[PDB]
Amino acid sequence: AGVITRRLNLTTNATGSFQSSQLTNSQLLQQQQRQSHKKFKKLIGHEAKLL
DNA sequence: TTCAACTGCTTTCGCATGCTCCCAACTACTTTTCCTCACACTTGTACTCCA
């Protein structure tokens, strides 16, 4: 389909004009929810004296 | 004059597409905190050879 010109990060989602892919409006709460799902990383200090 | 010219534009369909990793698999040495007791000196109480 012709020739590839460029590529930038916006996304049409509002049946016409676009409302998506605006950068780091959610990244502040992205990398503070990634490392709570898995558990028990064993970076343990006074803990395990107990366990 | 005589001649090319190369640029411009148009149908026909259309064929229609062109600094080097990032992560697996091997492996290895090192990382991290724990664990159970040897060495040696010293101190005691004794009985020896002390005049």
Swiss-Prot record:
**Coiled coil (UniProt feature):** none
Signal sequence bounds? none
Q: Where in the cell is it found?
A: Nucleus, Nucleolus
Q: What domain of life? A: Eukaryota
The region called B-linker is annotated at: 15-49
Which cysteines form disulfides?
A: none
Q: Which family does it belong to?
A: Belongs to the RRN7/TAF1B family.
Q: What is known of its domains?
A: Although it shares weak sequence similarity with SUA7/TFIIB, displays a similar subdomain organization as SUA7/TFIIB, with a N-terminal zinc finger, a connecting region (composed of B-reader and B-linker regions), followed by 2 cyclin folds.
Q: How does it assemble?
A: Component of the core factor (CF) complex, which consists of RRN6, RRN7 and RRN11. The CF heterotrimer may further dimerize to form a hexamer. RRN7 interacts with RRN6, RRN11, SPT15 and RRN9.
Q: What does this protein do?
A: Component of RNA polymerase I core factor complex (CF) that acts as a SUA7/TFIIB-like factor and plays a key role in multiple steps during transcription initiation such as pre-initiation complex (PIC) assembly and postpolymerase recruitment events in polymerase I (Pol I) transcription. Binds rDNA promoters and plays a role in Pol I recruitment. After binding of UAF (upstream activation factor) to an upstream element of the promoter, CF is recruited in a SPT15/TBP-dependent manner to form a pre-initiation complex.
Q: What else is known?
A: Present with 398 molecules/cell in log phase SD medium.
Q: What is this protein called?
A: RNA polymerase I-specific transcription initiation factor RRN7
Q: Which organism is it from?
A: Saccharomyces cerevisiae (strain ATCC 204508 / S288c)
Gene assigned in the entry: RRN7
